[model samples]
Target: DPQTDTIAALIADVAKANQRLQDLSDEVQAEQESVNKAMVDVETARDNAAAAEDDLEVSQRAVKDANAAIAAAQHRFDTFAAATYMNGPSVSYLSASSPDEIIATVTAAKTLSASSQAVMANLQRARTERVNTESAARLAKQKADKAAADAKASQDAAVAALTETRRKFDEQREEVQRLAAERDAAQARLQAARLVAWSSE
Candidate 1:
């Protein structure tokens, strides 16, 4: 009957709409996954940046301690020199007369002054190294932060696009379903008209 033909056309239309909706759904799902991954990367970058900041603080503290130690060492050396002013130029505080003698033997009541001074210098150098390391770490953290922010923005855009696509697909699918129903009803009426015409004939 003509109704059957109309129904078949309606079914075909629904099938096409369903296929298009499926494609849109697949795209939306993929975008959702990508957004999730972007969020994870953003979080990871934030954590890394925080850790780098902590390390930078620690390095700054080391620099402060090194500066203090250098000052103290200089003060101690000056005090020793002032005290031994009456003794003569030979009163160097770090010289030792015997291999067994401490490095500070040049001053009475010897201590390992030379080694201590060297250690202080080394500490100062360490502070410099720490400062450099801290700067590099801070820069790395900044880069990571930027990368994370960019990814987050990308994910947000993708999410919006996916949502819009899905919405459009749903609307179109509903329209298709409505059109199919109308077509089916139209075909049924056409078939009834044909039956009456034939019966009258």
Candidate 2:
């Protein structure tokens, strides 16, 4: 009975090890599922980060183009004023080509200052439009920057989660492997236990 007890004990140990191995395998499969999800999340976050950056660049470019247009319009108004004061207020001579381009403000204003003021009025309206455009662009930039920041945060979080989860999974697998080896060694010892029983018989 004692020899039978020894055989039974060995069998139980082997069975336990097999069950534990199966359990460890299951746990690893579950953990890997989570790690895979983290990687997918990282991919999505990376895409969003790049998309936000693209919008930011386009929005800033719009603001710059708007500024350039406003500056160009202001220059035109100044050149027309200079031509009015230098030459006759009735005409604008561009580049000394000697071709008289009549002032567009004819009959709109009698005095030179009044004629200039008419151009100024139109220029002011353009400036007002530029101001609103610039304001809208600034708001777009703020929102784009915020989106980029949030995307970056999510990417970092997902990557870190993947790293940490995989690390723990490997660590646990190492322990499981160690236990499996020990279980095998126990089976080896059970061979000697069988020999002892045979000798006694």
Candidate 3:
């Protein structure tokens, strides 16, 4: 049965290669999944950048309104402090009045000034924050774009490399199937060869 053992060894070798190719196929599929995930991340980053841009426009408008209000308030305060009227009930206007009157008048002015400054500062800070957010969003989008491009390139390369591997494995499987189909033919040939050798003996 020397021929039988030889055929068995050939089958085992082919089977081992088939198993290794299966493992490689699994690895390639996993890599493809990762590439798809990276592509999705890139799309999400683009959407986030678009949303941030919309918010930036709103923030810019808010800053403009805040600046206008602060200027108007400051002008009103200056005019009120410079007024010379001192007849009405709220006429504690001058700086050289009694201690209590001076304290009350100056405290009112300071409070109004502080309020205006606070509103202006808040608006300015919001504008600065929007700018920073826009920058971050832009950077994220750029990185995602590059990552997606690279992932697609890698996927294409993997597919190309795997094509030949898949073809070879398919050929090996076909050979195994052919061997099964021609079993009778192979045995007949073996018997004929044996008969010829015995006849010569």
Best by TM-score: 1
| lDDT on C-alpha atoms for all candidate structures | 0.74, 0.63, 0.64
Encode model 3's per-residue lDDT on 1-201: one tens digit a residue: 888775566567657656766776676676566656656665765666566556666656665666676677667766655562354225653345677875876677788778767766876776676666666666666665666666667666666655656666677667666655465465667789989999999
lDDT of 2: 0.63
Judged by lDDT, which candidate is best? 1
Winner of 2 and 3 under lDDT: 3
Candidate 1: the clashing residue pairs are none
Residue-level lDDT of model 1, residues 36-145, one tens digit each, is 88778778777876787787777778777777878888788767766765454346444444654434445443344666677777878877887787787778767777
Model 1, residue 176: distance off in Å is 2.3
Q: Assess candidate 3 and give its TM-score to the true structure.
A: 0.40
TM-scores, one per candidate: 0.66, 0.56, 0.40
The full ranking of all candidates by lDDT, starting with the best, is: 1, 3, 2
User: By the TM-score metric, which is better: model 1 or model 3?
Assistant: 1
Model 3 Cα displacement at 184 (Å)?
12
| Candidate 3, residue 94: lDDT | 32
* After superposition, candidate 3 runs with Cα above 4 Å error: 64-201
Estimate candidate 1's alpha-carbon lDDT, on a 0 to 1 scale. Answer: 0.74
